[PDB]
Amino acid sequence: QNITEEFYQSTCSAVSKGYLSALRTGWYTSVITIELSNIKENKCNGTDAKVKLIKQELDKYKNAVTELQLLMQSTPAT
Amino acid sequence: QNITEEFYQSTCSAVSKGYLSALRTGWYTSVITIELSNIKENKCNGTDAKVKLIKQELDKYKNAVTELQLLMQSTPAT
Amino acid sequence: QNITEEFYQSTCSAVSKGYLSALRTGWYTSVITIELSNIKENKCNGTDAKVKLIKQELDKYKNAVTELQLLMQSTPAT
Amino acid sequence: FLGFLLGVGSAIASGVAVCKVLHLEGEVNKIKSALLSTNKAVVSLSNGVSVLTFKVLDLKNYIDKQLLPILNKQSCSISNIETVIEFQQKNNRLLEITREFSVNAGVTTPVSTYMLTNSELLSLINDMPITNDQKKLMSNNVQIVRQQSYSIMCIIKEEVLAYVVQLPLYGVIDTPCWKLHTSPLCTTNTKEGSNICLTRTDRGWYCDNAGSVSFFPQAETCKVQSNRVFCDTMNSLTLPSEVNLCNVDIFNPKYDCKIMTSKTDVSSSVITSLGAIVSCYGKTKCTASNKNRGIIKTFSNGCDYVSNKGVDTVSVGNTLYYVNKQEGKSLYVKGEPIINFYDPLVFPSHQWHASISQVNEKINQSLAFIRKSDELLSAIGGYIPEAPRDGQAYVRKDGEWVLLSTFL
Amino acid sequence: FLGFLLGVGSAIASGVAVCKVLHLEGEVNKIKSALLSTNKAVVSLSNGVSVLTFKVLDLKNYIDKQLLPILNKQSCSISNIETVIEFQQKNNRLLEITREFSVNAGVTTPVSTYMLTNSELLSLINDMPITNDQKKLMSNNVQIVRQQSYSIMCIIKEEVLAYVVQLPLYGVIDTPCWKLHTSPLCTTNTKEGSNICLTRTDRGWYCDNAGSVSFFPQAETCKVQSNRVFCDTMNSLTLPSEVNLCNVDIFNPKYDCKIMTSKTDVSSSVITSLGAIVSCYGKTKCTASNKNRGIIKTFSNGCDYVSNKGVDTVSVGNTLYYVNKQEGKSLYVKGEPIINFYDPLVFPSHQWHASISQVNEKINQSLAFIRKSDELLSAIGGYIPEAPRDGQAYVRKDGEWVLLSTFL
Amino acid sequence: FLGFLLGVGSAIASGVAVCKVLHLEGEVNKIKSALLSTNKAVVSLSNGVSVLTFKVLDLKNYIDKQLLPILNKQSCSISNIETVIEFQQKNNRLLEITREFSVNAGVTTPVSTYMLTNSELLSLINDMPITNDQKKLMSNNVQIVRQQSYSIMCIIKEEVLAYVVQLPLYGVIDTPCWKLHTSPLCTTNTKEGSNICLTRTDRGWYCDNAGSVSFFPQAETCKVQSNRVFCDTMNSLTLPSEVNLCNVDIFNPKYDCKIMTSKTDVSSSVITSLGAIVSCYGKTKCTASNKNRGIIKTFSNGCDYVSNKGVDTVSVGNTLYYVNKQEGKSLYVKGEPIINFYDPLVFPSHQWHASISQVNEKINQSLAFIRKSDELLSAIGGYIPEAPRDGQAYVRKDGEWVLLSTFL
């Protein structure tokens, strides 16, 4: 980096030099996938403890999947 | 959807047709409420485990309520 | 607050008065620090339970630190 | 280009007005005490307005059925589970809500799932005074509806928290919209600087509405979704339908079409719904390609167009634009660049904005008040001065009234 | 309209300058070793600047008092609780901080509660060199202060992390501000196209400041809060107070008021602090309603106004604008639309921007240099050409100098 | 100023085009069944395009190796730990992803660590068809790359979720860029209103590119990082390199430099990479200070400049601008304000935008078509009318053709 600048009094303007490009010219697209399961309710009466907290993070799972489904079937906007 | 487009060479312009409106004309306002409790510190010496983690999510509660109070008493901006 | 407004029919304009300034003129800068540790992997075979969940929040720690390092060594942009 | 013709609203004046109402001491209790223990009343207040209300989180009770079921045999012990989980994640919500208002100083959009859940959102959408076409629309597009909604922190009192929520009403639905895309049209003639241009400035979305046309000059205050356009009427002008005459014949006597003039012939492209307009000028390299097999058309100076059937990409200068792959039919309507009808020699240099007929008027102004003051100056080398006021009766001769001597 | 007169700053040049300083090898240690084990020093460095420093999270120790209290009898066992919780939620913060800098490439605003807690924020506000009017102000509006603050990732070293935080100084407080709202003023006469308009372009916020007036052309770089306006001086011009003369008499000799001319008479509204301006032109339907009971005023073409006492809504074309319900008194000052003082026939077509007197000058230019070059052309059908330079002394007669024969 | 010369792209037309492809019934299975149990295939589809695919989260299996390892001896019990943690935090990710698409209606940027992890990101960057200069660049700046990436919700099917991710390709790297900063240049003469100004409108970033120059008119669609400028070519024009001639001699015959004229002499500053331009006009107080020791230069009316060596701050009116502390050398190139070469009396009032030579042309137009129509009017008090067409042969005399009597 040897950044330099010149002011031009004639025209009230100034130019800073010394910089290096990184321009986006194009795009790499790649598909990103996630494998899901779907389950019935087939659970439990119970419990002791550490399947009460497992079932929860799994209510959550179904919640998520529910939203994404709700992003129903149209073009997303730029 | 029968989306179509015409380019006009005379005027360097083009029109894409086939679309359907959904315009916001107005608003539905409704009040959304949440009932709160306020507690003293009246807690415990203790413990074993599962009231150490309950008291925490409840330090958190008081924290939240503290902030919202701090959104003191003026107009919010559009 | 004695907020008042005048409409001027001559010029299709209007002025609302009664307000009080709070203008940012300047800045207070202060350095905010966080002391970190760095650890080897020196852990455990195990366990019972409550060091499985401690080690995790500590995988997380190393993750964070990894990102911040990755915010490598250049100017951040305004 | 035309956004500076917008008026200017106040997006949450309605929500804030409901808020202002909640601060009349008696008013909150009235809300509290009307949700006694139904969870969705429709209270009315001192001014007596219809406030649909809706309790979404009872924590007073939940905490005052385990301040009690824990202020007894704790101090101190371990209780169980289930009662943490049910709480843990109730409080959680309130923390999210609380983050949101903290960072946005009490006003949020889009309106989040924590601020109102699909479950809650869909009920509201259901008892709304709106047709079923609407109900369906909103229902098949909740995240859009979220994006057009604001949430407003309102009051925190002894043990009530309220915030107002502003939901879009879609009073106009399923009418035909369209999108106008424009690019600069210039002469392509050879000495850099001799050229003139014109750009229709009337780009945006357009939708049929109550007998007129709603026009949206900032085409990104409208979100397309397959073939449905969500707009907000706050950022629109209401125009006569005759405005569409500009796409039929830009010179029509029924509507005065807006344009901008310049001499700045620089190259660009506008990517349309089903193709690309290309405005190639000067030395610029302008191209279109199909992905598998590279360049398949090379543009000449002037303004031209390719559909997306076969094209994947268009390049202008050093800018690569991907084209939209949306299925549809394009039609290229041939015609003569209108910039070809104008004498450069009395074209307006720059004009921020004008209309076709405003330009025409200036051009007359210039044509006329040049050639009149020109066939005026086509009477020179042929007029003669005043002979002195000292009695002299000379007789015109030589380019001067000399001391005569020959034929008198 | 006037934002393009703004200069252009560099919002975090101060914060970044502090950062640059922290990279001088010796400098960090100096910080570390001056927070030895106080939690808020005020170090000074190689250049020797006053760096108020502040350690907000000791995890070195906390982890090196349970690397030790766990690298011993684990491997392997269960320890207890309390030491997870205290950590869990310390680390948590660091993760939030870390998210924030990750997604904003190392610069954030508003500044979050994780980046600095109310608790931490309020101390800083407390040892700040500022009056108590300020201290209070900031204290009663932390989320606003957050919104005007930036946080800047700075260094991560062996075991220090620092980021700089930039807090607003409010060097001007409690002075009188006001807001100017403007809409287009046009002739309302009947043949579409004959009309002319003018819009005062000088809209924005205005605040009294150090003997001059600070003006903010983008009225949304200012957040109102009941009756306090938070602005940032970076987006302002400093004007003579005489600028307020434009609201007293737009023709005043002391200040040259800015306007924009056009022929584009399209309809709109501007919602003010206590009402609505309405600029209704052409066929447009313009209205005002009160909520309970519907339309209660219908606007005539031209530009008019209603207060918010009784009105809830205003409609122009197909745009419904809610009015602000803020309590205040309006006053409608009658006067003659100034656009009525101008001859359409030599009004300027469009003028991006000008001033009242600039327009006046052009109008003279046009008035004058038409009628002089007109009472010039009021001497025609009455001038006579040169009789040949071949000695001829004719005598003016017939519309030609003929071969004479009668009175000589 | 020049952003309205940009064309207009469609940022996620490429990503959406990949999405459209995934909806052809056969296509998903082809993806699913090609990631059989490798985690990164490169499938091809019905049209037969090269879709690099990449499974980042197997939860089908993970949940169908503890639907099984829990649908058996639960109902009901306690299992252990490890299997929660491993899940807890897998699902977590999916929730974050799911939040993001929820609030942004299915399109996000910057692309988050949950949407793609450094670990995942860096692999992609590694099998990319790009040189190693690029690989390194991206690798040393992931959060920037994130900031230029979009993520696009695509399909949710029986048990697949896909989203497309759009990563920047940096096809131009390490070429010399520069930044042009401009401020208004005006006459400084004394009666308020007599003054004229001109502002070069061509500000922005500029980078050498494929033999031409890429220019970016909105200098904040470019992020600097020490001495590397990240731009996006979508918001650029491609210009001849001759454009840099404007910084050498603004009157040069090779490139027509863009300016804007006005009479609005208001004061401001532009903070540059290594200093400040100051445009001080009228009564304004304009200053520069060094931090430790206060004001050290006071500006005269006109346009001037200070480097950052010694200065920390610059004040114009009531606006305090911090200067950037970046190390570099400035050089003040003396020269005569070009606004001094123009007669105010036929300078163009306002001109949205023009070029040096366009202004020159108008000035001729005005110079010429004044003095020709002036040495035209320098033949008056010296022309004579038509003697009647009734045969009269008078002899010019007195300021009238009288009933003669003396020398005939």
Swiss-Prot record, chains D, E, F:
Membrane topology note: Single-pass type I membrane protein; Single-pass membrane protein
Residue runs in coiled coils: 22-73, 345-377
Disulfide-bonded cysteines: 177-207, 186-197, 222-231, 246-257, 280-286
Localisation: Virion membrane; Host cell membrane
Effect seen on changing residue 222 to S: Impairs translation or folding of the F protein
Resulting phenotype, residue 286 to S: No effect on F1 and F2 structure and glycosylation
Glycosylation sites: 364
Segments for region (Fusion peptide): 1-21
Chain ranges on the Extracellular side, renumbered to this chain: 1-377
Top-level lineage group: Viruses
Written domain comment of the UniProt record: The N-terminus is a hydrophobic fusion peptide that inserts into the target host membrane. It is buried in the center of the trimer cavity before cleavage by host furin. The coiled coil (heptad repeat) regions are probably involved in homotrimerization, heterodimerization and in the formation of a fusion-active hairpin structure.
Record note on quaternary structure: Homotrimer. Heterodimer with fusion protein F2; disulfide-linked. Interacts with host NCL; this interaction plays a role in viral entry into the host cell. As a heterodimer with F2, interacts with host heparan sulfate. As a heterodimer with F2, interacts with host IGF1R; this interaction activates PRKCZ/PKCzeta that recruits NCL/nucleolin from the host nucleus to the plasma membrane. Part of a complex composed of F1, F2 and G glycoproteins. As a heterodimer with F2, interacts with host RHOA; this interaction facilitates virus-induced syncytium formation.
Function (record text): Class I viral fusion protein. Under the current model, the protein has at least 3 conformational states: pre-fusion native state, pre-hairpin intermediate state, and post-fusion hairpin state. During viral and plasma cell membrane fusion, the coiled coil regions assume a trimer-of-hairpins structure, positioning the fusion peptide in close proximity to the C-terminal region of the ectodomain. The formation of this structure appears to drive apposition and subsequent fusion of viral and cellular membranes leading to delivery of the nucleocapsid into the cytoplasm.
Protein known as: Fusion glycoprotein F1
Organism taxonomic ancestry: Viruses, Riboviria, Orthornavirae, Negarnaviricota, Haploviricotina
Portion held of the full protein: 137 to 513 of 574
